[PDB]
Design a protein around this ligand. Sequence first.
Ligand SMILES: Nc1ncnc2c1ncn2[C@@H]1O[C@H](COP(=O)(O)OP(=O)(O)OP(=O)(O)O)[C@@H](O)[C@H]1O
Ligand SMILES: Nc1ncnc2c1ncn2[C@@H]1O[C@H](COP(=O)(O)OP(=O)(O)OP(=O)(O)O)[C@@H](O)[C@H]1O
Ligand SMILES: [Mg+2]
Ligand SMILES: [Mg+2]
Lengths: 570, 570
Amino acid sequence: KSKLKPFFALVRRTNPSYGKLAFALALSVVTTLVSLLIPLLTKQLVDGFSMSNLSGTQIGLIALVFFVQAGLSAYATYALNYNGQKIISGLRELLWKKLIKLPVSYFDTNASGETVSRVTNDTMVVKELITTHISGFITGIISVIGSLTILFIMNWKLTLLVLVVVPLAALILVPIGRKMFSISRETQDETARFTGLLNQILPEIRLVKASNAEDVEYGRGKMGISSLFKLGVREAKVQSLVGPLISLVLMAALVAVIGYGGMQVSSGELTAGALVAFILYLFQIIMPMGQITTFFTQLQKSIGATERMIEILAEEEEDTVTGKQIENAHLPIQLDRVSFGYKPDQLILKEVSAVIEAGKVTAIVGPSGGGKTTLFKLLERFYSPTAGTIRLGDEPVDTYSLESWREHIGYVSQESPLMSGTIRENICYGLERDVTDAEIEKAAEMAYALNFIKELPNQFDTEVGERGIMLSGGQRQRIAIARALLRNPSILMLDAATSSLDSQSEKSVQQALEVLMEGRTTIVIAHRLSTVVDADQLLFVEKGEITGRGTHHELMASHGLYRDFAEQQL
Amino acid sequence: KSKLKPFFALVRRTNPSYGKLAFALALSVVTTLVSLLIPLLTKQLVDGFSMSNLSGTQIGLIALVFFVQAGLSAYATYALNYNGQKIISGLRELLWKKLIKLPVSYFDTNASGETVSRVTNDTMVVKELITTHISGFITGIISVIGSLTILFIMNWKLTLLVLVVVPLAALILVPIGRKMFSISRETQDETARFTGLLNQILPEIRLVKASNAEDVEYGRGKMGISSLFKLGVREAKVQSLVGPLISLVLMAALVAVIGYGGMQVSSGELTAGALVAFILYLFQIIMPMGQITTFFTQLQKSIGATERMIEILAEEEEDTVTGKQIENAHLPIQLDRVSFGYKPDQLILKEVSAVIEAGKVTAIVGPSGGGKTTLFKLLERFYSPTAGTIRLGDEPVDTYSLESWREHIGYVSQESPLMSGTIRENICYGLERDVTDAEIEKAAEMAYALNFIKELPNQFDTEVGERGIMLSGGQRQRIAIARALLRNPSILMLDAATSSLDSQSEKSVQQALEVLMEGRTTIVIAHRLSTVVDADQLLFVEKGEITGRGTHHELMASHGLYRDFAEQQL
Ligand SMILES: Nc1ncnc2c1ncn2[C@@H]1O[C@H](COP(=O)(O)OP(=O)(O)OP(=O)(O)O)[C@@H](O)[C@H]1O
Ligand SMILES: Nc1ncnc2c1ncn2[C@@H]1O[C@H](COP(=O)(O)OP(=O)(O)OP(=O)(O)O)[C@@H](O)[C@H]1O
Ligand SMILES: [Mg+2]
Ligand SMILES: [Mg+2]
C-alpha cells in the first residue's frame, strides 16, 4: 500500500498546533519571498543608499525593519519548535495509553523494554524531523517555484530542460530513499533490542556479581553497540552519497542546456549574454533543491521508526464496554469445561470443571507445573478461556465488565511484586476511594506487617526501591497481602501467599485472614498441606486437570497420590 | 571549577577518528578558501564568458572540477558523521564497561533504569551535536577571520569598532549559555526519570490489571510527558531569544560604525563607496556568525547532557587484583565480630560471630527480617563488613581476589531470578568453560528438572522470556538450583530455594543436595525446620544476633520461647 497516508494520519491524531504551524509557514513564506525579491532590484538598493547618504533620519527605519525581520524569523522558529514538541508529546501520550491498555498476552509475547525504547526513541526521531527540515523544505519549495517562474519569464524554452531534470532527480533519489527507510527501521529496532537487553541485565548486576559473568555481559553490550554503530555508519554513507548524485544530475542538466543553447544561438544569438544570466540563475536553483531533497530523505527516515509505532497503535484493548456490574459479589463460581494454551497448540488446562462455593476456602494443591496459577489467571479473566466459560450463578462471566469483576477480587501473585515508591503507595496502589490512615493501619495489622513498618521512618518513608529490593522477602509478601486485604474484595485469591514467611508469622497471618475473610469466598494455593488442612473443598490439580475433588479425608482416600504428599509431610 | 575541560577529557578518553576529523577540517578550509576565491572568480567568470564561447574542453574541465569539489564536500560530511558515530560508540562502550563493575551498593541506591536511560539519551545528544555543529563552527570561524582580514585592510577604525562590538555579543551569550546548560541538564534528568518509571510500570503489567489502576498509571505517564514538554518548550524559548540578540548587537555595531565613519566625513570617509562597500562586507561577516554562536550554545547543551556521565565514570571498581587465588576451598569459615548495615548508621547484623564447619550443613534459621539474607551477601563479599573480618582458618577473606572467592561459591538468590534466553543459556553464560550437553543434563537431573524441560522443546527452543515469566514459579527455582549445582562449587550457600517447590520435588532436590553435601560444604537458609532437622549447626538469627547455636536436638532443648517454632511446625 502506502506509508505517507498512515504517517500523516498519525500526526493528525496527535492533535498538533495546526493553525499555529500554518501561521508560522505563512510568515516564513512571506519573509522568504520578500528577501528573494529584494536583491533583484539593485537599482532600488543604490538609490536608497544615495538617499540615506542624503536623508538624515533613515537609519531608524532600516534598523527597525531589520529588527522586525529578525523577530519574525525567531518567532517562526519558536513556533515550529513548539509545534514539534506538542506533536511528540501527543505521540507519547497516545502510545502510552495504548500500551497500558493492551491485554496481558501482547506483553507476554513481545516484552516491555523493546516497547519503551520504541515509544521514547521513535518520538525523539519524529521530533528531530518535524522542527527544522519542514521549514527547510517550505523555504526551498518557495524559492524554487519563484526562480522557476523568473526563468520561464526570461525564456519559455530552457525551462523545459529543468522540467526534464526534475523527473531525473526523482528517479536517482528513489533508491536512496528506500535504502534510508530500511536503514532507519533496522536502527530503531536494534536500539530497542539493546535497551531491552540492558534493562534485563541491570538487576542481574546483583545476579552477575553472584556469578563471575561480568565479561560475558560486557561482551554482549559491546556486540549490541557494534551493531548499532554499523547501522549508523551505513546510514551516514547513504546520506553522504545523496549529495553527489544531485550534483551530477544538475551538472548533466546544465550541460544539456548549454548544448541546446548552442543551436538556439542561431536566432537568439546575442541572447548568449542572457544565457550567461540564465547560468547564474540556474546556480540559485541549486541552493534549495538540496534542501528539498534533504527533506525527502528525512521524511523517509522518520517514517521508518514511526512505522513500528503504528503497529502498536492498532492491537485492540479491553475496557468496561459491557457495563454489567456484578452488583451481587456473593455467588458460587462454576468452572465449566475450560482449557488453556498460551500458544494455540499446547494445552495446560485440559477439560477442567468444578465449583468454588462461596463462604469456604477452596484450596488448589498439586505438584509444581500442574497449572495452578493459570487457573487464577482465568478466574481473573486475564485471558479468555478457549474450551468453555466460567459462570457466577448461571451467568456467563463475559457478561460482566472488567472494571467491575476485577474490583471485587483480591489477587496475591506467586511472585509478589512491589513498585518503586513509598510503602503506603504500594499498599494503596490503584485504589480510587481515599484510604485516610485507619484503613492502612488495619490492613497492616491484619497482615502482621505493622510490627516492622513502625520500626522504620513510618509508612511514608523507606522507599522500596526497584522491584522491592530495599525490603526482605517476607516483608514484601506481607506488604502484598496487606494490599490485597486493603482492597477489601469479595473474592480473595492467595496463590503461595505464605511461601517465604516463618511459622509464627504464617500462623498469625492465617488466623487474621481466616477471621476476616471467613464470611467471603477465598481461593488459596498452598504447597504446604498444613495451611490447607482445615479447608472445605480441595481441588488437587495434576497436569492441568482436577483428578481429586473433595474434602481432606475424602480426597485423601480417593486420589492416592495426595496421600503421598500428606504422608511425606507427616 | 570548570566544565569544558572534563568534557574534552571524556571525549579524548575514547578513540575518535583523528585522521578523518583532520581530513574533514582541511576539506572545509579549502572549501572556504574557494569561497574567498569567488570574489576573484567574478573577474575569472567574466573572462570565462568571454572565452568559453571559444572553448568547450575548458567548460568540460571546469564542470569536472565542480563535481570533484562536490564529491570532496560529501566525503568531508561522511567523515564527520563517521567520527561522531565512533565517538558515541566509544562513550557507550566505556559507560557500559564502567557500569558492569560498580559495587552492588551503588545499584541498590541509584535506580538502574535511570542509568541506562542516561547512557542512551546522552550519547544520542553528543551524536546530535558533534558532526553538524563542529562543521558549522569551523566554517563560521574561518569565514569570519577571512572577512576580518579584508575589513582590517579596508579601514582601521571601523574594523576596530566591529571588534569592540564582538565582546558585547560575547557578554550577551553568557546568560543564554548558562540557561541552556541548566535546561539541558534538567531535560536529561527528566528523561531518565520518565524512562525509569515506564520500565518499572510495564514489566509489572500483571499487577496493574489486577489492581485496576490503568488510569493512575496513565496519569503518571502524562505528568512525565508534560514535564518533558515544558522543558522542551523552555529550550525552544531560549534558542528563539538567542535569535534576535545577535541581530540587535550587529545593528548597534553598524550604527556605531556609521557614526564613526561620519566622523571620518572630513577625511577617510571621502571614499563614501568604500564605506558603503564596508556595509556590504558587514553583511557577509554575520552569515558565518549565525553558525559560530549557535555552536557555542549547542556545546553548552552537550556539556549538560553528559554531566552525569562525568560523575558516573568515577566509582572505584574493585574486581580481580587482591592477588591471592583460593587453593584449598576446604577450610571452615570463621565469622568474627561482624556488624553490617546498608545505611551508614542502622545496624542489620549486630556483633554476629560463629564458625561454619567445612563439611557440615550450617542452617541459618529465624523469623523474617532477622537478617538471614544479608549474612549470605556478606559471605559472597557483596558488601564489606564494617565491624570485623572473615577468615578461612586464620586467613582474612579480603586477601583472596573476588574472582577466586566467587568462582568457588554457589549462591541461590531468594528471588531465584532468570534472564531472557534459552533455558540452557543461563547455565551456559554462568560459566566460561565449555559445559558439553552431558554435564548440563547431569546438572538438570540433579535438580529434578530434567523431565519438565524434556517435555518442552528440549532446552533450546524454550525461551524463558523477560524476568522468567514463561516458566512457572517452581520451574524457575529448579532452574536456579541447577545453575548453582552446575558450577561445581566448594561452598554451596543455598538461600531458601525449596519455597515454591512441592513435597515430592522438595524430597528429590533434597536428596541431590545431600549427595552434594557429602561432596563438600553447604549452607542453607530454611523457613521450615522440617527440611533442616538432619543438619549439624542449626543457627538462630534474630534481629541480627544468633541466639541459638548448636545441633537441632540441643538447640531445641536449650533455646527458650522460640522452641514454639518447632512446636508450631509440629
Ligand atoms: N506465558 C506463560 N505463563 C505461564 N505459564 C506458561 C506460559 N507459557 C507456558 N506456560 C506453562 O504453564 C505452566 C506454568 O503455569 P502453572 O499454572 O503450571 O504454574 P504453577 O502451578 O503456579 O506452578 P508451581 O507450582 O511450580 O509454582 C508451565 O507448564 C509452563 O510451561
Ligand atoms: N537495601 C537493603 N537490602 C536488604 N535489606 C535491607 C536493605 N535496607 C534495609 N534492609 C533491611 O534488611 C532486612 C532485610 O534483609 P534480611 O537479611 O533481614 O532478610 P531475610 O533474613 O532474607 O528475610 P526473610 O526471612 O523475610 O526472607 C530488613 O530488616 C530491612 O529493613
Ligand atoms: Mg530472606
Ligand atoms: Mg505455581
